[PDB]
């Protein structure tokens, strides 16, 4: 059942839908800004209506 799903193919003919690869290293959410704003009651809830 795995040969029938084209597991036999040359892996060099499989292209990403963008044609590119990617190495992402992004500074992310830590949560110190949101917890600080909650204690000061400035912006307690950050989730918007949308």
Structure tokens at 12: 């060099």
Quick one: 17 or 40, whose CB is closer to another protein? 40
Residue 5 CA, chain-centre distance (Å), reads: 28
Range list of H helices, 1-50: 32-39
Q: Which of 7, 21, 23, 42 binds another protein (CB under 8 A)?
A: 42
User: Which span (3-11, 12-20, 21-29, 37-45) binds another protein, by CB under 8 A?
Assistant: 37-45
Q: Which of 40, 45, 47, 48 binds another protein (CB under 8 A)?
A: 40
DSSP for residue 39 = H
């Amino acid at each position: 059942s795995m040969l029938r799903n084209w597991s036999w193919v040359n892996v060099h003919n499989v292209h990403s839908v963008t044609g590119t690869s990617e190495n992402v290293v992004l500074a992310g959410y830590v949560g110190l800004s949101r917890t600080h704003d909650y204690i000061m009651d400035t912006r307690s809830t950050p989730a918007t209506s949308q």
